[PDB]
């Protein structure tokens, strides 16, 4: 009704009408800008305006500064948004980040257990509630888009991202797609499968990743080839993408991996033919980081081809993330030369705009300062603590069938020992994608280590001694009632985590042997995956697979001291040796140390 009315700016109008109205006004430069996502590290107000940039991200560890507050994050994001809103059309950018176990790049964010442990809970409603809390903590920092969930079905634990997979069993991964409506909100009653959805300003856009077969690569080699017939691809690796469509996942990220030698980032048949045309996905498809570069061998050796192949394959938004001028220049040339039709550009931009309008981003482009206090909120930590406890799998509770069960341990004892490299190391208990991509060691954020949790749990008369790596004599002479010893993997992600031997670093086993040799012991194993465990088992009275439980170490002691019983069950096969791999439930020659679904129980004290 005002004389300067512009339909796309009218919040009362249907999303599709707003999309069409804006699209019809855009120049080629404005269109290609929407398709471009850049790192905050290369962003400036002029770059964002002049190139009509559609999206920014923080990669792992890409932060305004170490220890930044929620408000500092909001101010940074809003500064970028102010630049984007100052363009001719005022299209807001969407800011993405890997919030994969909480808002994990941010100091003081609640850190939830990694996905493998969540699979052990068999509790999809718990995972939904984690999505809900994670959305609040992401919005606390002004960010609107999380690159989660990873719905890989990890079929070989030698993969460095196996901890990002809920299970080797697709049925468990499918169940855990409940993360999506946690992050985004529940879809309405009449909802069409494949449409994008986000409820509003207190929720975030989600991302089902990495499409498809990322968990199926040969020998678990990250980014490698997945060799499997269509029937197996569709039976193992694809199903959870359909659940994600049904729950309105807003975006899908493409895998670095290949399927039978075809790069996913160049696979028109799967990206356009299947995801878009068969599953009816109507959100946007985003590349992985320099994913189009890696289409070629060597990577980046023909970036012109990378742009052509990826955009023709059906990708909508490119996580460049640094060389935006080159990306934009090359894509512009391809359109100008008729190599890429305007129809393909218009489809990509239609999808990007659909997600942005749907989620309310044109109505609330800026951060809400009242949300900053959601970061690290005690209610969310209480949830993480529940999740950590439910994730724990009890593998042994007594050396013989006639021994007294060691767990639960008594809170009142004259003197107890807490030992091991992982007993008082917050970074190690969080693992990868915590503060940095690869994670880190020591007190990297706000949390409670296993040692701190023990001290918070025990009777006031119980003396707690910590020794990181005590010798056998120290233990034998110490007058201890029992010991809790924690060891395991160091933090990792992506290719750095690929590991053909799956043996934990020393000292780990040597400390368990020294401790358990002198006093009854409960071994807590911190890992992203099954690892060689027979020697640890042989030494230990009790052993718990605690995965990567996150910031809330009291989840571990909640079960050790019997406040709750152990309930977790293995979401993966535990192998006898790495020579067996790959080896999954349902295989012909299945000879596990512990089958998928195994877990001992205790009752609460």
Author numbering: -2 to 602
Which lines from the publication concern this structure?
HvExoI catalyses the hydrolytic removal of nonreducing glucose (Glc) moiety from a broad spectrum of poly- and oligomeric β-d-glucosides. The crucial role of substrate binding in HvExoI implies a pair of the aromatic Trp286 and Trp434 residues that form a clamp at the +1 subsite, which is positioned next to a pocket-shaped site at the −1 subsite, housing the Asp285 and Glu491 catalysts.
The well-defined electron density maps of the (1,3)-linked thio-ligands illustrated that the saccharide moieties were attached through the networks of H-bonds formed between nine to ten residues in each case.
